Ligand SMILES: *C(=N)[C@H](C[C@@H]1CCNC1=O)NC(=O)[C@@H]1[C@@H]2[C@H](CN1C(=O)[C@@H](NC(=O)NC(C)(C)C)C(C)(C)C)C2(C)C
């Protein structure tokens with residue numbers, strides 16, 4: 238029993254993290270086979286950041302301007318190129334610890350683990366969701382750029398996020414591993430702001446199922462509702478609309494608990510309208526939306542990885 | 544900026560986890576140098592658990608009754624002994640991935656990361672605190688026994704917890720790595736219950752400092768209080784008493800924010816008496832007590848490990 242915000246084990250990623258220095262700027266890189274991936278803004282000076290011309294800035298660099306350190310070993314850079322917003326440094330040594338991996342671009346609502354790093358060294362791991370406005374609510378300080386987000390599927394590391402910047406509201410923005418930003422952000426210091434965020438409805442329902450599995454049943458009721466009546470209520474409260482795909486995704490949890498999806502929606506509708514009135518669910522006094530249906534199954538069924 | 548429940552990177556522990564089978568029971572073991580540590584209840588059958596005589600049960604076993612698997616490799620057990628509630632299996636191979644480590648018995652209020660495992664394989668990592676009643680609020684399913692809790696200090700893994708059992712309230716109990724239970728629990732299926740829990744005051748104050756560091760200041764006020772007036776209020780609300788040692792521990796955070804400890808206690812006193820009135824702190828609508836002062840410093844200053 239029990240329910241925690243659980244991250245994937247980080248060991249397979251820790252062995253891929255390196256330190257990248259260009260000029261006075263040091264951040265983190267991801268070393269897979271013989272390529273080191275890192276944010277291209279590592280090539281900017283203070284002068285450059287209001288409106289950098291990255292093609293100009295890169296043509297003025299040579300391989301020896303990039304210092305790559307894996308622990309104490311220095312890696313020799315033998316080529317460099319830019320793909321969208323990531324720099325790719327070809328090095329003379331293939332990482333012997335390269336895991337089986339793929340690069341994936343995730344959608345809003347999906348969750349992943351972040352390995353936060355400074356100077357090429359892991360500081361800590363935590364779980365977070367891609368918000369509907371394409372930011373993440375992370376925890377990052379100076380020097381953290383290049384830290385990556387990932388999932389594990391059996392034996393395969395799926396990299397989905399590389400950290401680039403913090404927005405003035407204290408939330409975070411970055412790219413997939415092919416260098417494309419999530420959201421409408423750009424890697425220059427121009428005024429930018431996150432859109433308004435919404436609550437990820439399908440995840441809130443998954444977490445209410447987890448609560449039932451763990452014995453928290455006080456919010457259940459005998460009613461039911463329809464998708465259209467539910468979605469009309471949800472939109473008043475800044476909740477994402479529920480689709481039939483979402484209903485089907487929640488199938489395994491509905492079956493395990495014997496509570497139909499649209500029954501659970503009727504409970505959520507009540508919680509939105511009347512509130513929780515100083516009661517808690519799974520130790521929280523707010524409705525939680527950073528667990529996916531798969532996260533719940535994984536943690537309430539005990540899935541492992543190799 | 545940002546503040547998350549952050550676990551230590553798990554890589555150094557993942558390489559120490561193995562599978563231990565005795566009879567029909569399989570759980571996890573910890574493989575350090577040439578010794579595998581695991582809960583001694585692995586030697587019990589269903590018949591044995593109401594009142595096992597572990598000395599009898601162990602004398603009836605031989606080395607070949609214990610199957611130890613590290614991935615696909617089988618490890619040959621060459622000796623066995625019992626220390627308190629842990630079994631120590633001597634094996635013929637020293638783990639080449641043994642990190643620098645020590646064994647530490649922690650006190651209530653301290654936090655650590657748990658690497659939850661099934662069949663010798665890591666499922667996920669999460670952070671939790673040793674509660675004042677010597678339980679942890681973990682997330683564990685069948686087969687999870689032998690999963691360990693740990694901290695990292697520079698280059699050294701400090702193991703502090705091995706999982707043994709779940710109590711009827713859904714919380715968890717286990718031992719240090721020398722086999723001594725935390726709390727008044729025993730490894731037999733007799734009626735046992737956790738004492739009443741209290742809230743870890745020094746951690747709540749640390750988390751309020753984190754909130755200030757991250758810009759959440761609405762709960763601050765101009766008042767101040769004394770330790771004795773504070774402790775009189777705190778005891779009414781099931782909060783642990785505050786000591787002068789606690790005040791000194793909070794020194795670095797007081798200095799960084801310019802808010803004196805006893806000033807912050809006056810804010811907490813107000814929060815206890817009037818409540819939060821539907822406002823949140825660091826995204827929570829409850830006062831959080833599973834971050835230590837060191838956890839806050841580490842995460843708001845960016846400490847790493849090697
Ligand atoms: C990467 N190492 C840091 C990560 C920052 C440090 C504090 N927390 C974080 O997430 N990222 C950067 O240095 C990026 C990079 C230049 C500035 N910047 C920022 O994150 C700034 N934000 C910023 O300028 N935001 C707007 C929306 C563009 C105004 C900063 C340092 C947090 C003020 C560039 C964007 C190229």
Ligand SMILES: *C(=N)[C@H](C[C@@H]1CCNC1=O)NC(=O)[C@@H]1[C@@H]2[C@H](CN1C(=O)[C@@H](NC(=O)NC(C)(C)C)C(C)(C)C)C2(C)C
Pocket residue numbers: 238570584592683684685686687688689707708709710711715730731732733734735736
């Ligand atoms: C270890 N693999 C499991 C971990 C359990 C499984 C569900 N979640 C957990 O934390 N632990 C055990 O099998 C221990 C072990 C025998 C039973 N037991 C329990 O955890 C039971 N609890 C129990 O009997 N509790 C009281 C307080 C003693 C009544 C169970 C399976 C959760 C009912 C022994 C204690 C030797």
